[PDB]
């Protein structure tokens, strides 16, 4: 029993984290094969104002890169841009390169963060992508280049690299192909995050998780049609639920229908009545159906 | 915001092995030429009270199956160290990290590598409660999951999961075989005493909320240490010994401990339908050091 936000083990990722220093900047890079991927603003000469990245690359001095891994230093063969990331060919192949691929995370989907502080892996925790392409990820100075990953079927999927924090605290990064999530720019100009639309699928999983744990104070016999909830959702900043069949395993092991839990969302979105669900005071959309079934049925 | 985080688990992952005895399957910690696991893996009937010493006398060492990826281990001998089975195996763990054994105390945080039938599945942070229990997420086949803490470049093994109480609390032992809270590894109903909340950790939890911009719960009102402790003794909260541990947190936020102590007494009554860091009640799971780490590095 129990439910905790969890991160898949980071052992397979830790050997790929390196310190990348250049000029006045020090951050993290991902050492896979004979490459070191890192945010391209590591070569920015002035991070206090807008950056001309075309000019910064045209004047790059490969000798100024200082990439380190324990007592090892990696020399840079060449440097190019791939989106908002620098691709640095290095003089050594990482002997601990795991079988891996690359992909992008979509809103409402969970993945793991290896928070690294200037080349030194510091912590590991799970996150969930928000509607606007952001995450809440406890990133501070020196943590750019920190890697987000997902483990599945023996393959390591790199899916996120950290870049910046918005004025409202939300955190922004890119996939390893250099595409910033949410369309944000790696420029030190003020940027806005639109309204946060909560994942309806994740909230249903959060309520199914409480029922399985034996917490049943919030459920009633009242139900709500999917079409009615979706109408309420697109008015209250909640995503639409495409099918009740997507929770067929959770409804079958608890005996509770999805339409029953939809009623609970609109009712609980008004307030928890001084009580809590799994210690939370409000609805939580950071747990996916996959992520609940894992914790609780193996 | 604020989230429970785990220290990187790479140094521990190579030590986890699947331990199977008959139809029983759980996890073990492979250190040196030894595999440590909960001793009830050899129990013939985990629904009844177990005569462990007699069960070990009737153990078939060859009935064990211990494996991890491309590693398969054979058992040479078996003994008990407290509630843990210590199996000497015919191969050393080539990646045994330098480490020590110690016990965590109430209010202290540490990391749990959740393992499912030999496969490290997840890692997450936990906090030791007053009655020697923790609130995690353990299910069948997760016994033997190891808890660890990295302090000062030193790896410490501090926990091995064993059972779940009727109220959902989770019980394990240190790596020396001593059960936390004195519970027994027997299928017998046992009760957890009244939980005493860590006042140090709640003050850190409120400091973190202030850092995140959530300051609706604050006021210029304050409460002396002597006054709070007199209140803590009769409301299931620990006493605060000094404000030095928060000197830094107070330096940045500019908020004093005595201000936050008043907030505890007031917020202990209820949050009035409002939230603090997504919580609807005071949280004592984050230590001063934990908050200083996440917020400032
Ligand atoms: C990489 N080490 C940091 C990580 C930051 C530091 C504070 N929290 C984080 O997540 N990334 C940066 O410092 C990037 C970097 C220049 C400025 N920057 C920012 O994150 C800034 N924010 C923005 O520019 C904004 F508001 F538009 F998002 C800062 C004010 C320092 C948070 C560049 C090249 C964008
Ligand atoms: C190890 N794989 C499991 C982990 C359990 C199962 C569900 N959640 C957990 O943390 N441990 C056990 O199965 C231990 C083990 C026998 C019974 N047991 C229990 O945890 C049971 N608890 C009790 O009997 C209680 F409450 F009295 F402590 C169970 C009912 C399955 C939760 C032994 C040897 C104690």
UniProtKB/TrEMBL annotation, chain A:
Subcellular location: Host cytoplasm, Host perinuclear region; Host endoplasmic reticulum-Golgi intermediate compartment; Host membrane
Residue ranges annotated for the Peptidase C30 domain, each copy included: 1-298
Function, as annotated: The papain-like proteinase 1 (PLP1) and papain-like proteinase 2 (PLP2) are responsible for the cleavages located at the N-terminus of the replicase polyprotein. In addition, PLP2 possesses a deubiquitinating/deISGylating activity and processes both 'Lys-48'- and 'Lys-63'-linked polyubiquitin chains from cellular substrates. PLP2 also antagonizes innate immune induction of type I interferon by blocking the nuclear translocation of host IRF-3.
Quaternary state and interactors: 3CL-PRO exists as monomer and homodimer. Eight copies of nsp7 and eight copies of nsp8 assemble to form a heterohexadecamer. Nsp9 is a dimer. Nsp10 forms a dodecamer.
Family according to the record: Belongs to the coronaviruses polyprotein 1ab family.
Name this protein carries in UniProt: ORF1ab polyprotein
Full-length numbering of the shown residues: 2890 to 3187 of 6695
């Amino acid at each position: 029993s129990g439910l905790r936000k969890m991160a898949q083990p980071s052992g397979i990722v830790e050997p790929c984290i390196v310190r990348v220093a250049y000029g006045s900047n020090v951050l993290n890079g991902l050492w896979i094969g004979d490459e070191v991927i890192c945010p391209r603003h590591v070569i920015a000469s002035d991070t206090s104002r807008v950056i001309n990245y075309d000019n910064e690359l045209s004047s790059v001095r490969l000798h100024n890169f200082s990439i380190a891994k324990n007592n090892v230093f990696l020399g840079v063969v060449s440097a190019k841009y791939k989106g908002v990331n620098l691709v640095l060919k290095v003089n050594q192949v990482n002997p601990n390169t795991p079988a891996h691929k690359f992909k992008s995370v979509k809103p409402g989907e969970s993945f793991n963060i290896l928070a690294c502080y200037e080349g030194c892996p510091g912590s590991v925790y799970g996150v969930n992508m928000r509607s606007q392409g952001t995450i809440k990820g406890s990133f501070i100075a020196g943590t750019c280049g920190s890697v987000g990953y997902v483990l599945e079927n023996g393959i390591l999927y790199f899916v996120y690299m950290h870049h910046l924090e918005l004025g409202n605290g939300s955190h922004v990064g890119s996939n390893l192909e250099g595409e910033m999530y949410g369309g944000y720019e790696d420029q030190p100009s003020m940027q806005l995050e639109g309204t946060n639309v909560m994942s309806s699928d994740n909230v249903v999983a959060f309520l199914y998780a409480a029922l399985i744990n034996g917490e049943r104070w919030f459920v009633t016999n009242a139900s709500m049609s999917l079409e009615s909830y979706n109408a309420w959702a697109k008015t209250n900043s909640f995503t639409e639920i495409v099918s009740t069949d997507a929770f067929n395993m959770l409804a079958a092991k608890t005996g509770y229908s999805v339409e029953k839990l939809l009623e609970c969302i609109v009712r609980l979105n008004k307030g928890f009545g001084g009580r809590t669900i799994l210690s939370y005071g409000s609805l939580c959309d950071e747990f996916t159906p996959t992520e609940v079934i894992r914790q609780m049925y193996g």
